[PDB]
Design a protein around this ligand. Structure first.
Ligand SMILES: [Ca+2]
Length: 297
């Protein structure tokens, strides 16, 4: 499965999920004419695989403009299943009623949708977080359900943060907490659990690499552990998903390696295998051209 995996579109900010034997893969879609101005993103695209290698294209799943309160900009996202429903947390640009980037939540009854705004309003709004003056801090959501039934929302650019999510998945429960322990944090938090440990991987520095920290609890304390991913080919933004599928571990990300004239604002999803050490640490990723081998049940 030669990387990059999709060649008919540029494709970025991957998020993935396993359901009923299939991997569902979610990505934003880079529509920019060149690598020299800025992101131009309007819609998220959905893909699914049997085996990690052959991908079925289900087309657009959600456009940013599907949020009445949103101006545009369909930035990084993450989907989760809970109670026969699917929650899609998005980064969009709020309209001038609450200036600045915001986090919204959509809902569907199946992995491919149809998806609709679950709230009719932002879940996180720029003015809720004012310990930084920048107006793109509230981006890149990540979502997690711990073994005790408690769900959590993580996000941030420049300022990493989390909060408890109510069962209904569309409401914060309790206060927003600043996360300590993530040297050089930039963005792209991805939380997951493996065996007895918790893992918070993130984009780090600039141009971005991915670093990660481990915790004995979802509330940490987090212990930075080293570099998970080198800086990716022809792109300053590095953006991960980590999933477990069929006894192998998958590290999904993007590169500027596509054609034609791929790069900074014309990115492409690539996939490579992740391996754990016996102590629980993750081997540094090796980003490869040939990508991943099939692996179906
Ligand atoms: Ca803010």
């Amino acid at each position: 499965a030669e990387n990059p995996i999709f060649t008919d579109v540029f494709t970025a900010d991957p998020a993935a999920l396993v359901h009923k034997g299939r991997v569902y893969l979610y990505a934003g879609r880079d529509e920019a004419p060149d690598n020299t101005t800025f992101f131009v993103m309007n819609e998220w695209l959905v893909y699914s695989s049997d085996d990690m290698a052959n991908w079925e294209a289900h087309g657009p799943g959600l456009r940013a403009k599907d949020f009445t309160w949103a101006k545009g900009d369909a930035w990084a996202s993450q989907v989760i299943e809970r109670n026969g429903k699917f929650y899609w947390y998005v980064t969009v640009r709020h309209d001038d009623t609450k200036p600045g980037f915001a986090i919204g939540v959509a809902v569907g009854d199946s992995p491919i949708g149809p998806f609709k705004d679950a709230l009719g309003k932002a879940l996180i709004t720029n003015d809720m977080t004012t310990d930084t003056p920048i107006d793109w801090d509230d981006i890149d959501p990540s979502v997690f359900i711990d073994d005790d039934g408690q769900a959590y929302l993580f996000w941030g650019n420049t300022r990493p943060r989390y909060a408890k999510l109510k069962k209904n998945m569309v409401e914060l429960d309790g206060p927003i907490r600043a996360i300590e322990g993530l040297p050089e944090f930039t963005e792209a938090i991805w939380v997951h659990k493996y065996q007895d440990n918790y893992y918070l991987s993130y984009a780090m520095g600039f141009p971005e690499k991915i670093g990660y920290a481990m915790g004995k609890s979802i509330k940490g304390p987090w212990v930075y552990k080293g570099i998970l991913n080198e800086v990716a080919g022809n792109t300053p933004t590095n953006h991960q998903a980590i999933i477990e599928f069929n006894n192998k571990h998958y590290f999904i990300y993007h590169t500027g390696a596509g054609r034609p004239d791929g790069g900074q604002y014309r990115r492409s999803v690539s996939i490579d295998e992740l391996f754990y050490n016996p102590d629980g640490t993750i081997k540094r990723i090796v980003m490869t051209t040939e990508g991943v081998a099939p692996n179906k049940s």
